[PDB]
Design a protein around this ligand. Structure first.
Ligand SMILES: NC(=O)c1ccc[n+]([C@@H]2O[C@H](COP(=O)([O-])OP(=O)(O)OC[C@H]3O[C@@H](n4cnc5c(N)ncnc54)[C@H](OP(=O)(O)O)[C@@H]3O)[C@@H](O)[C@H]2O)c1
Ligand SMILES: O=C(O)Cc1nn(Cc2nc3cc(Cl)ccc3s2)c(=O)c2nccnc12
Length: 315
């Protein structure tokens, strides 16, 4: 089905548009095209530095009577420099102001790591280490719960949390709301079998990010692996008369994941949506899972000694 049920009773569309690295000058048109072709879920974040331009697109389509607000599923995220309990509400309200909305469908803790508060998204010491903050996941979570109580967000969740970090929230004394979603990197080179099994077993929906392997990530090398150019995945696409991107988007859907491919290119936005008219076989699924290499595109070397760095754990 085209939507998954969350723990608040809301239905989250299984396909969403990603917006990381969508330049402000191009993203408004990307969002408008996405809504026209049928996307009803947009994945946003303060750190993407383009929420105003995403907001413009949403407002235009609401005013054109293309969609009403209740048919859209808008996700944003709390950046690392705002983990302090007293900064969370302001951060959420700023995102809401930028998006020109009065509520979010889902608001995520972007990373488990708190960074020193300030103007810089990535505060670095003179040696290039990220400067942490004196914050912890449980206290941040309590501040996230308050946003639900106040009516600013319908659901809260996490992103880039490992299973122990998820467990820490689940076992919080006085927990008010369980996390609805854990958004994690997921693709054929990083299949995340253990963490997905964990999260699904705990009734947390998983969203797969970078499903095409983020070929526009800033730290890519032309030598690095390329899912969209992997000849084995091209073969699977050819067999179904689909593109490699369509195979990579359908793959997580058949694992009961939400998936959020990014594009600012209208043709690709439309292409990427054409994934509801075919099915990958059992063999195809097994084959794509067999490509796992624990190859992670989203991490920073500069964050690896943070107490809450998520990727030292096996899962
Ligand atoms: N929670 C987190 O920490 C986190 C981390 C990473 C990502 N995310 C979310 O997940 C989203 C998706 O991940 P991502 O942006 O890293 O990368 P991605 O969706 O895996 O790949 C995006 C790249 O693929 C290209 N592309 C898109 N569709 C294509 C197609 N049909 N044919 C060929 N190329 C295609 C895009 O080009 P063009 O745009 O130029 O067309 C862009 O270069 C993000 O935008 C963000 O919303 C979250
Ligand atoms: O956080 C994202 O959604 C993607 C993202 N990912 N990354 C890599 C990161 N890895 C980590 C690892 C940690 Cl532990 C904390 C924050 C980050 S951000 C970036 O450097 C970055 N820079 C600007 C905007 N988006 C990003």
């Amino acid at each position: 089905a085209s939507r998954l049920l969350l723990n608040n009773g809301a239905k989250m569309p299984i396909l969403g548009l990603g917006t990381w690295k969508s330049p402000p000058g191009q993203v408004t048109e990307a969002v408008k095209v996405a809504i026209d072709v049928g996307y009803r879920h947009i994945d946003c974040a303060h750190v993407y530095q383009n929420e105003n331009e995403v907001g413009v697109a949403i407002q235009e389509k609401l005013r054109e009577q293309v969609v009403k607000r209740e048919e859209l599923f808008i996700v944003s995220k709390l950046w690392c420099t705002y983990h302090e309990k007293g900064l969370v509400k302001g951060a959420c309200q700023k995102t809401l102001s930028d998006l020109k909305l009065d509520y979010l469908d889902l608001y995520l803790i972007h990373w488990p790591t708190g960074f020193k508060p300030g103007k810089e998204f990535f505060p670095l010491d003179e040696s290039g280490n990220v400067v942490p903050s004196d914050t912890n996941i449980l206290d941040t979570w309590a501040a996230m719960e308050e946003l639900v109580d106040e009516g600013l967000v319908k659901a809260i969740g996490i992103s880039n949390f490992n299973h122990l970090q998820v467990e820490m929230i689940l076992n919080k004394p006085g927990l008010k709301y369980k996390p609805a979603v854990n958004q994690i990197e997921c693709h054929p080179y990083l299949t995340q079998e253990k963490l997905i099994q964990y999260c699904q077993s705990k009734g947390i929906v998983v969203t797969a990010y970078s499903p095409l392997g983020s070929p526009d990530r800033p730290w890519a090398k032309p030598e690095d692996p390329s899912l969209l150019e992997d000849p084995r995945i091209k073969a699977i696409a050819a067999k179904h008369n689909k593109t490699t991107a369509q195979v990579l988007i359908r793959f997580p859907m058949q694992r009961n994941l939400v998936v959020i491919p990014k594009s600012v290119t209208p043709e690709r936005i439309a292409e990427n949506f054409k994934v509801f008219d075919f099915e990958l076989s059992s063999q195809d699924m097994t084959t794509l899972l067999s490509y796992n290499r624990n190859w992670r595109v989203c991490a920073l070397l500069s964050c690896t000694s943070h107490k809450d760095y998520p990727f030292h754990e096996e899962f």
